[PDB]
Amino acid sequence: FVDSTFYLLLDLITFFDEYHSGHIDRAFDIIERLKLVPLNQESVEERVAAFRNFSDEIRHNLSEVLLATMNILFTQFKRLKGIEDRDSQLRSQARTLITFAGMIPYRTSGDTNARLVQME
Amino acid sequence: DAICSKANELLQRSRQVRESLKEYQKISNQVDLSNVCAQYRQVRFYEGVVELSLTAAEKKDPQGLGLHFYKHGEPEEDVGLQAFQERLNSYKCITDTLQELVEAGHHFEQMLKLSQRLFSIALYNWLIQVDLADKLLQVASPFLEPHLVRMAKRYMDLLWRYYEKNRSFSNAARVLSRLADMHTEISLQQRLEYIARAILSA
């Protein structure tokens, strides 16, 4: 258990290194790997069920996990210029993430200013 | 009559070649305007033409008679139907012109940024037919909010529009709830998706 949290913290850190310094695409891939945040469907709630269970160390970290996601998600999905462009994904991801954030704002520091980054 | 002929000439000189535009504004009225409108467009006068059409619509009606007519919505003379039928023709002209535009923005904002609650309601109705409805979310107009509200009960699209429209959580949730409760066939999966959404807004 102790080691597991350890690796998670390291993974999150590598995500940080690559978050900024560009590499928007890479950040999403890694964050998803964490298996903390709902990329799939409305499984956002399962992410609720598995949230309280979370160890104290991680439970604290989630705030940044979200908003990192809505950032890369934003910047990467800068509306492009002028073909296959599936904007839909990396869009659904924000949606699931927001539902997630919506469900646990009380158990979070109190910055659903995801909204600011969310829109434009 | 003669005045109308003069107006056509007024524009006609303008067809050949700011002033004639102004001269037209003075003259503007009725059906002959339709032909005349095509002429205004020739020298890319879309924006001015819309205000033109709108002002004309208001000029005949002054004012607000049609609104009363709609309230009753009676086929009888009620307030007089004639005003309503007349304006719609002008409105259709405005919409017809809008379509031709497709410097797009300057033309549109003019229409929206005008004070005419039948016009905007009509515009929206025009937009829905086009399936322009998503664009509707964008429209800032103060007229828009009442439009959605009144229309609220393929209205579902209007409502999908509405809850989305409400940035505010409370208002959005109240709508989805009604959406779920609603008597039009909507699958439970959606009914629940509405609730899942509505609940999230908690």
Six-digit token string for A100: 């997630």
| Cβ–Cβ < 8 Å for B127, B95 | no
| Cβ–Cβ < 8 Å for B53, B25 | no
Distance CA(A29)–CA(B184), nearest Å, equals 41
- The minimum CA-CA distance between B200 and chain A, rounded to whole Å, is 6
Suggest the residue from A42, A47, A48, A115 to mutate for an interface test with chain B (most B CBs closer than 10 A).
Answer: A42
Rounded to a whole number, what is the largest CA-CA distance in chain A?
50
**Pairwise CB contact (< 8 Å): A42 & B200:** no
Chain B residue numbers touching A42 (CB-CB < 8 A)? 193, 196
Chain A residue numbers touching B138 (CB-CB < 8 A)? none
Helices B2-16 and B32-42, interaxial angle, to 10°?
10
> What was the resolution (in A) of this experimentally determined structure?
21.4
**Pairwise CB contact (< 8 Å): B201 & A102:** yes
Chain B residue numbers touching A99 (CB-CB < 8 A)? 196-197, 200
DSSP code, position A80: P
Chain A residue numbers touching B200 (CB-CB < 8 A)? 99, 102-103
The half-sphere exposure of B77 on its side-chain side, counting CA atoms within 13 A, is: 1
- Dihedral-angle region of residue B22 (phi above 0 means left; psi in -120 to 50 means alpha; beta otherwise): alpha
Exposed e or buried b per residue across A68-90, where buried means at least 16 C-beta atoms within 10 angstroms of its C-beta = bbbbbbbeeeeeeeeeeeeeeeb
- The minimum CA-CA distance between B196 and chain A, rounded to whole Å, is 9
**Pairwise CB contact (< 8 Å): B193 & A42:** yes
